[model samples]
Target chain A: AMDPEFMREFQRAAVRLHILHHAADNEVHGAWLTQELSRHGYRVSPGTLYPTLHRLEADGLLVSEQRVVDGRARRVYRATPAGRAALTEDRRALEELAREVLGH
Target chain B: AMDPEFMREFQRAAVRLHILHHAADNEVHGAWLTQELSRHGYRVSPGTLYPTLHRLEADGLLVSEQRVVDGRARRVYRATPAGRAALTEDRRALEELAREVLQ
Candidate 1:
């Protein structure tokens, strides 16, 4: 049988890891992250994404700033050194877990 | 950040899928399954494993028989046809989800 609840939480981790992966090098913003995740088949909503991003910022894994683009203000996010460190940890954990299941 | 709660539930799915994967090809029992899962880094409780196996049997995905082993009765399980089909679906879904995360 299939469990959708577990899938939801697992998807959250995937989205967060994807965020850290991108933000480790480039400044990422909400719209791009949300849309790009969807493009990759992860449909994260504003309700879910905002709270998660805020949590990363509160945890000091990420920092944010506002920049004006085309006369509109947009918030940007980048991973902190701490975030990159955690990303590496998560990468290893998930890799081992993935190797166990369909590691195909 | 690693959410332990998420990892716990995700591990549940992984363990269950593992049951279907192995049982589809061979008979499986509880204690051996527990030891095997631990070998793979999944520390599951007897409490969690038994109920899940029973649920699969109740759902018609798994069927069981009692086999005497070393003068003791041991219940063995194998995937039914439906269980094998469901395992295939789960394999695809988890693969997609895994790609999104670690790919």
Candidate 2:
């Protein structure tokens, strides 16, 4: 569960958005991202993380390439131009929504 | 679909939060709030809106009362104290999350 524990559905979308936020900046992989999300208080399992990454790739927001790391093959992902634009747009909407919700 | 049409899931949660925002201030009925949500660019159907309201009440975040209005019984909703507190807490989280997501 996400912090605060209410809005489980909202937090799922938030986790995806957070994934995009990082991918927009740098290349990322499942294991690393799972740990990254944990830092944000999201206890995401590989079971959940892998599917979300695949979905983001499927949605054209991300692209993946296979690379050999430590004598093992690994898939790395990065955000596409469309993904960057989507994250930027979400940032804008998030600001407006936050203002209204907070009445400030 | 919501405004941008991408975050359909997030908008559903936003809709529920918006309902609580209004209910926390005043007694609200469905018909009026359907228009209210549309004003915010959300095309919420009765099918969607009713269930959401019921769910909020079920979660103890809201309470409803039946009142006779113009010879018809209408159910109106208001936020409970717990609901008000929940919205306030969500507002705090939203602020912090916004900073990180935007940064």
Candidate 3:
């Protein structure tokens, strides 16, 4: 098994990305994501963020395209159909977990 | 950076453990955990599960005790106070994610 501390960081990043996927706007960039997650208490660096974006795209959960804004090329990501489905299932699972934890 | 497939496995295991921590009852052993997680579509080996248990205990998220039951030794685990607090924070974060995603 992985170290618990590292596992916690990994978990937080995954959850935060899932949440951020919903909040991301058309102009949002990787730096924006990094900043938002950091603002919300996740310790993330470009080292962690870029690979995660690539991985999510590879997994068919996210689709990325390049756009030109202000004379610079930026990659924009949106949840794919598969990604939305996965998020929905995860949300249900999270709700179930809440019910179990809350004893309701 | 880690591979994408491996990262998915790691994320799934972490979330599954957090979910299971709330559901686990007294007398639920590592075997039970492995079986439950496997049933939920996670591929886990005893080798992976046992070490994860140890790591959680090491991080102070869980406390474990060994007891003899029916001539067999088993380790039982309960979430520590810190674990409870962590779970609460995670839950709130999850809720906020739901709102953002379902928008």
Candidate 4:
């Protein structure tokens, strides 16, 4: 059984990733993260964003690498093995939620 | 602005209430709670039940009163003013989540 609160957070995080799924792996810049999320109707502050990113990275849902782009070091993120697993679980839960919502 | 995860729990709780809303005020017994929720696809354990009930009571979203039925005490719960307010907020947030999910 899933805790409703935890499920909520998990789903939100997964949906955030879903929206970003189409972007190039290396194109996940900070501004892009904020903009794409906001465009999808999620209100994200840098406060919440950075911490969640770090937590996800710690949880192995994301991997980050630093590269010199132009003159500054930019850290890029991609989903890791654990992240893909979480996303799969999220999708299954989401399907269940949709079934309930739609009276299926 | 709503946190997506908070919105999820808020909506789940709200939807749970919405299903229970149709029942008589005093009909929210433990069996009913479990059965109705399971029917709605929420898997709840008794462990989660007592605590959530306590929290809801503490937050004033629910109020409980004891009544004797056939010589045994039964605690009945009903939504309080605060519960109503929370339900209202939950409803509004659920609407937003629905719009996004549907798009």
The worst-scoring run of ten residues by lDDT in candidate 3 chain A lies at A18-27
For model 3, residues A1-104, the per-residue Cα lDDT tens digits are: 22345456545545445533553334357877777777756677889778877877787777888998899988987777776666656555545544544440
Tens digit per residue, CA lDDT, model 2, A1-104: 11133466567767878998999878998889999989986768999989888887887888999999899999999999888888877666677678777760
Q: Isolated chain A: TM-score per model?
A: 0.87, 0.87, 0.76, 0.75
How much is A94 displaced in model 4, in angstroms? 4.0
Candidate 1 — which pairs collide? Answer: none
Flag clash pairs in model 2. Answer: none
In CAPRI terms, model 1 is classed as acceptable
What is the full ranking by lDDT, best candidate first? Answer: 2, 1, 3, 4
- Shift of residue A81 alpha carbon in model 2, Å: 0.9
Question: Highest lDDT among the candidates is held by which one?
Answer: 2
* Candidate 1 Cα outliers beyond 4 Å, as residue runs: A1-10, A66-73, A101-104, B1-6, B55-61, B64-74, B93-103
lDDT of model 1, residue A44: 86
Error of 3 at B13 (Å): 5.2
Error of 2 at A35 (Å): 0.8
- TM-score to true structure, per model: 0.72, 0.91, 0.65, 0.63
Q: Which residue runs of candidate 3 sit more than 4 Å off their true CA positions? A: A1-16, A23-27, B1-27, B35-45, B80-102
* Per-candidate chain B TM: 0.88, 0.89, 0.74, 0.73
Prediction RMSDs, each to the true structure: 3.8, 2.7, 5.0, 6.5
* Model 4 / residue B44 / CA error / Å: 3.3
lDDT of 4 at B16: 49
